[PDB]
Amino acid sequence: GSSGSSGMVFFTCNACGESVKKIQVEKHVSNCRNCECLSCIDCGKDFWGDDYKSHVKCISEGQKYGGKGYEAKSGPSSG
Ligand SMILES: [Zn+2]
Numbered sequence: 001g002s003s004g005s006s007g008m009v010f011f012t013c014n015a016c017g018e019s020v021k022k023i024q025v026e027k028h029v030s031n032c033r034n035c036e037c038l039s040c041i042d043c044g045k046d047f048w049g050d051d052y053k054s055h056v057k058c059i060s061e062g063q064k065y066g067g068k069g070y071e072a073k074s075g076p077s078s079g
């Protein structure tokens, strides 16, 4: 990313499939009017609707521990 230095929260548009940053979201949405949910690759979390907003950092998240359980991921939208 053409920026002074690296170190920001990135996201993955589940609408088309592009690497959209936190601040980029605003811009992206402009073109992509199909962005419903977003995911953070930095740590790995799902943010439906306007949830990603709250997500400002990836610290204090016990994600590493766990994960295992079931391979299958795809499922009913209603989660
Ligand atoms: Zn998109």
Ligand SMILES: [Zn+2]
Residues within 6 Å of the ligand: 009, 040, 041, 042, 043, 044, 045, 055, 057, 058
């Ligand atoms: Zn994150």
